[PDB]
Design a protein around this ligand. Structure first.
Ligand SMILES: NC(=O)C1=CN([C@@H]2O[C@H](COP(=O)(O)OP(=O)(O)OC[C@H]3O[C@@H](n4cnc5c(N)ncnc54)[C@H](O)[C@@H]3O)[C@@H](O)[C@H]2O)C=CC1
Ligand SMILES: NC(=O)C1=CN([C@@H]2O[C@H](COP(=O)(O)OP(=O)(O)OC[C@H]3O[C@@H](n4cnc5c(N)ncnc54)[C@H](O)[C@@H]3O)[C@@H](O)[C@H]2O)C=CC1
Ligand SMILES: [Zn+2]
Ligand SMILES: [Zn+2]
Ligand SMILES: [Zn+2]
Ligand SMILES: [Zn+2]
Lengths: 378, 378
């Protein structure tokens, strides 16, 4: 048994903004009530990790174990945990689903407040302390997940139990960008067959929106990116027209309006840039157009438009994890992937190891990844 | 000019139930106010035609010119007609869209009563007489369309103006089965991505439902037909599992429930058989399942179920022309076909001429057609 015992293991610790992550031996405490200790086998990285690592995250706390896109196998569970057990295959999710709060009970949102008072400050609810340490001193959790490690401890309300035959080096991506993108189409916008759609930003999120739109039956799927190399790549995900704002003097919204004779039925902003968010709203069609903000803007940044845009029938909205309830629906997305109904594999451009995580981050930084997946054994 | 003049032309006249249609020379009167005379180039036939021809239609009136799935070119228009003109390419529709009645104004239905008091009894609204005759004696219109003719006269509220570059030997199918099927999914049911669907009856309507479901993002698309040869054909339209009721002693609803562990999210009955309609309702999932009746049952036939089926969350509904507004949306479907977003060609199994219409009906009778299209020039 490792159960009830401290586990020493490899993990990538971020000690300071912008410094290379150091691969330490760390102590992972056993799970307390309501907690789940997971053997993480594969973890993906994304710009959300890098953002905090670069010291730009006002909620960032050092030293910490980053990582929030993973899949693994439950090693043990704490007192009272019943939905997973040792041996279950799981995806830890930064977005909880407690099923007991007024948000979960509402039936009108996927947001759940249950553990965010602890996970927002790098600790666990049960004792308001961390489960990670080196040389007797605590290392903060990150986003309730901390998946840059061979083992992590997470709240049971954050653990999705998945099909035990799913490939763990692929379905690690179903914890972040892919569900956000697909559900922005399916849940937040509810795009109807024949809709025309604009997608601003063709990274992983944007490409998942394009797949979502394609699956929902959209007609014109117009991608907008400042990097024209993204178009060739985006075609397999369903993007079927492309505009680079740099090729035009006019604001991009006017360009899209001209291209569609009035605007799109739905737009999605998958960058996190307030000016593009405004453009995405303003390129929607009068009367019925809807824009969904998926991008996460920096602190203090504001979106603007003229109220006539909304008075004349446009709707402004946004999405958090595609509107998916994590514990209930991440398993459902895994099922759809196993049935070849959603892409996952095609988003993984590189496969490295946890040991080479610093190299993964260099790949991320240079725009070379869609998703880079890390094997935590080496 | 043929305009303002009577036109003599070929047309297939049905004089008596079950007798071979006779290809006469007929007189087509010029259009009066609100009417449109159309040079019909291609017309498809379907079981709706045959039903009336076989004398089973209580609204059937003889002698008559059958046919309701066509495409052509406007020859002339009557007083006051402004939405089409001579030379426009058109699809005459059995379902009007006047835009002025309480049904059109409702925003809650595609049914329009405007001309059905005349078209239901084989005549025109303007003068309550027919525009067809042989040897001075009147021939009734059928379904406001009468497309088994080189020329017909229809109400302007029934004429969809379409893209002038569309192939008229294909888009004749967008006046009946294909929109009914696609819109049963898109408009009546509003099937969401990932839904499981059952389709009862894999003719043209059923196959259009399958295409609709596929386009909407459905997961399991289960086809049910008493002819197992329909499965191979149905696969290209999106059917991905198949059940023949004959291979099972249990009622088909129990079979589907077993296959899906509880039932489908949506079912569609595309036959017109009250017992299968009940089966389609009862194979829907508790809590949220919805069945859509597309099939048109015989007079006096009734559907039945136990109320607990509905009390426990199933919804029973039906569709008329897929919920599409004809004049506004048939042009839209043509646009989608031209953009390769909906199939049309694949439903056309044979191409004959109006002269061989009796042979077309034999093909129809033996189950050999999905859709048989007729060139009216020969
Ligand atoms: N709402 C939510 O729950 C979630 C939001 N996100 C957010 O989604 C956004 C995208 O994430 P990823 O796809 O991983 O990022 P990414 O960095 O891989 O992709 C960004 C893309 O936007 C393009 N771009 C940058 N500036 C542009 C401009 N001015 N106009 C057009 N294109 C431009 C880049 O060329 C790049 O292709 C981020 O803000 C991220 O925080 C991510 C996950 C969940
Ligand atoms: N609601 C509306 O607006 C419209 C309704 N319709 C109706 O849709 C229905 C289907 O039309 P089409 O596809 O042209 O007919 P079809 O005759 O081409 O297809 C009927 C299919 O049902 C199958 N079938 C017959 N009995 C069966 C059973 N007991 N169980 C399972 N399968 C069975 C046959 O094998 C055949 O494949 C008809 O009732 C027609 O009147 C057609 C157009 C519009
Ligand atoms: Zn991520
Ligand atoms: Zn909750
Ligand atoms: Zn028909
Ligand atoms: Zn009307």
């Amino acid at each position: 048994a490792t159960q009830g015992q401290v586990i020493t293991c490899k993990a990538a610790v971020a000690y300071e903004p912008n410094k290379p992550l150091v691969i330490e031996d760390v102590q992972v405490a056993p799970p307390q009530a309501g907690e789940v200790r997971i053997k993480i086998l594969y973890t993906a990285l994304c710009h959300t990790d890098a953002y905090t690592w670069s010291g730009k995250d006002p909620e960032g706390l050092f030293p910490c174990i980053l990582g929030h896109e993973a899949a693994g196998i439950v090693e043990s569970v704490g007192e009272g945990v019943t939905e997973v057990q040792a041996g279950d295959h799981v995806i830890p999710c930064y977005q909880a689903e407690c099923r007991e709060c007024k948000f979960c009970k509402s039936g009108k949102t996927n947001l759940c407040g249950k553990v965010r008072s602890a996970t927002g400050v790098g600790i666990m609810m049960n004792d308001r302390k961390s489960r990670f340490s080196v040389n007797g001193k605590p290392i903060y959790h990150f986003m309730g997940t901390s998946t840059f490690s061979q083992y992590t401890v997470v709240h049971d309300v954050s653990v999705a139990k998945i099909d035990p035959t799913a490939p763990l080096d692929k379905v690690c991506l179903l914890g972040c960008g892919v569900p956000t993108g697909l559900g922005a189409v399916w849940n937040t916008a509810k795009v109807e067959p024949g809709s025309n759609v604009a997608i601003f930003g063709l990274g992983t999120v944007g490409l998942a929106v394009a797949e979502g739109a394609k699956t929902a039956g959209a007609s014109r799927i117009i991608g907008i990116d400042i990097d024209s190399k993204k178009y060739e790549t985006a075609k397999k995900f369903g993007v079927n027209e492309f505009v680079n704002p740099k090729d035009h003097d006019k604001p991009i919204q006017e360009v899209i309006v001209d291209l569609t004779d009035g605007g799109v039925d739905y737009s999605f902003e998958c960058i996190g840039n307030v000016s593009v968010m405004r453009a995405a709203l303003e390129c929607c069609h009068k009367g019925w157009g809807t824009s969904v903000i998926v991008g996460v803007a920096a602190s203090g940044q504001e979106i603007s438009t003229r109220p006539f845009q909304l008075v004349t029938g446009r709707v402004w909205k946004g999405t958090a994890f595609g509107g998916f309830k994590s514990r209930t629906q991440v398993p459902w997305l895994v099922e759809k992937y196993m049935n070849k109904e959603i892409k996952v594999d095609e988003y993984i451009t590189h496969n490295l190891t946890l040991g080479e995580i610093n190299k993964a981050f260099d790949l991320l930084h240079e725009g070379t990844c869609l998703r880079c997946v890390l094997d935590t054994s080496k």
